[PDB]
Structure 1
């Protein structure tokens, strides 16, 4: 009897110890584009030293021209419009804003904010239905009320910021539509491998996309969640490409590197270590799922297949 299988370690954490406490500023809006903006059309750059990769290695670009995906961190409405314009120069198909954030977030007076709890786990353990209900209620409750919006500084705690009486509230779905993008939400918890529920939902969505759909994935800050789904999409769409090439190329266009590397954390972030190790194991298991299930058109869902073929630490 195993309480939590590999790929589900976060289920052991207690949601009540990470409840939200502040409206975090997701982007100050000073730049034209959100941070970490990158597309599959981009040239590959040298790998980051931290990953101890082979800088001489030349990854195959097989399928990258037709992949049609991009990623970025959070954005203001104006930044999303800039992203949409850039992507429209690359395709005539529908462009999707694939929101990978489980945390409740939205726009107050056009300012992108999120209800932040320790480790960005304010919605940990909630079903997507529950997470979205929390978001809807919180955003609506902010209208015509005074709120404190702040960036996180020293030790992931509020520092500075501003206080305002909100006159307009918008969901990301509304902002996406205003930018001419379709919207699709996958409520994935920050810092951990996406759940079987998250991936099942993504795969079902992937299956009904028109051939020319362009997927723009985004998370809050960094490249963890976006890279996981960009890697999964690359594997699904280009199954003949080696795991090494997929992992190297998604890292070299600006994402995270999801293969083995010497994990090193500050004491303050030692809790992240097992989650990084879990992600490495799970990306390999997903690759196995794609290889073993593509032939019959993925008749067996990832969640079902993973229960019969559990990953090992």
Structure 2
């Protein structure tokens, strides 16, 4: 009798110890595009040293050209419009803004902000329904109110920033439409593997997309959750491609490497270690799901399949 199965370690943490306490600046808006902007049409570059990968290896590009996905960090309304434009030059299908942020976020006076709690876990433990409700109330309560927006610096604590009386409030859905992009929200928690619920929602969403749909995934930094869903999409759309090729190419176009590697972590980041290891196992577990469930068209949802086929540490 285990309390929390592999893939659900975060459930053991206490949400009450990571409540939001400040409006974090998601992007200074100085660049034309958000950080870590990348597409499946991009050329593959040398892997990062930290992952100890074979730089000489040439991963398969089978399906890359048809994959039609991209990723990036958070952004300003203007940076998103730039993304939409760049993507429109690559496709004629609907471009989706896939918001993988569980944390409450929005735009105050056009400034992209989020209600940050330690580890960005201000909405940890909440269902998507509750997280969105919190976000809706907080965004609305900020109108005509004085707010403190600041970027995080020393030890993930507010550093400088600005104070202003909000005159306009917008949700990402609104900003997404303004850029001519469809919107789909997946309330996934930062630093951890997406819950069975997050993936169940994404999978149902995937089966409904038209053939020419372009998915633009993004989170706060655009590395962790963004690469995971990019990887999942790659596996789903290109099931005949090996796990190695998938992980290598998703990494070499600007994403994170979700395979095994010497996980080195700072003393103040040691809490991340087990989550990184958990994600490596779950990545393999998802790959197994796709291989064993594509034949009948995914009749069995991920959550259900995962319960009868739990992963090992």
Q: Which residue number in structure 1 is paired with residue 229 of structure 2?
A: 229
Q: CA separation in 2, counterparts of 1:244 and 1:86?
A: 29
The corresponding residue for 1:249 is 249
Q: TM-score, normalised by structure 2?
A: 1.00
Residue by residue over 1:250-292, the C-alpha shift from the partner in whole angstroms, topping out at 9 and shown as x without a partner, is 0000000000000000000000000000000000000000000
| Cα-to-partner distance string for 1:86-112 (whole Å, 9 max, x where unaligned) | 000000000000000000000000000
Report if the CA contact (8 A) 2:74-2:222 is conserved: no
Shift of 1:80: 0.2
Separation in structure 2 between the aligned mates of residue 99 and residue 124 of structure 1, nearest angstrom: 16
Offset from partner CA, 1:125-173 (integer Å, 9 cap, x none): 0000000000000000000000000000010000000000000000000
Instruction: Between 215-224 and 255-264, report the one with greater CA deviation.
Output: 215-224
Which structure 1 residue ranges, 5 or more long, are not aligned? none
Q: Does 1:163 find its partner at 2:148?
A: no
2: CA distance, partners of 1:183 / 1:79: 16
- Secondary structure of 1:101 counterpart: coil
TM-score norm. by structure 1 comes to: 1.00
In structure 1, C-alpha distance between the alignment counterparts of 2:208 and 2:277, rounded to whole Å: 32
Give how far 1:221 is off.
Answer: 1.2
1:292-307 matches, within 5 Å, as 292-307=292-307
Find the aligned partners of 1:112 and 1:258 in 2 and give their Cα distance: 28
Whole-Å Cα distance in 1 between the matches of residues 171 and 62 of structure 2?
Answer: 37
2:71 match: secondary structure: strand
Higher deviation after alignment, 215-224 or 176-185: 215-224
Moved over 3 A (4+): none
1:80-159, aligned counterparts within 5 Å?
Answer: 80-159=80-159
1:310 and 1:145 mapped to 2: Cα distance?
48
Contact kept? 2:289, 2:305, Cα under 8 Å: yes
- In the aligned structure 2, how far is the partner of 1:198 from the partner of 1:278? 16
- CA–CA distance in structure 2, aligned partners of residues 78 and 285 of structure 1: 38
Q: How many residues were matched structurally?
A: 313
Structure 2: segments with no counterpart, 5+ residues:
none
Shift of 1:222: 4.2
| Distance (Å, rounded) in 2 between the aligned partners of 1:119 and 1:222 | 15
- Any idea what SS the aligned residue of 1:98 has? strand
Q: Report the equivalent of 2:28.
A: 28
C-alpha displacement of 1:74: 0.3
Give the SS at the match of 1:187. coil
Question: Shift of the alpha carbon at 1:197?
Answer: 0.1
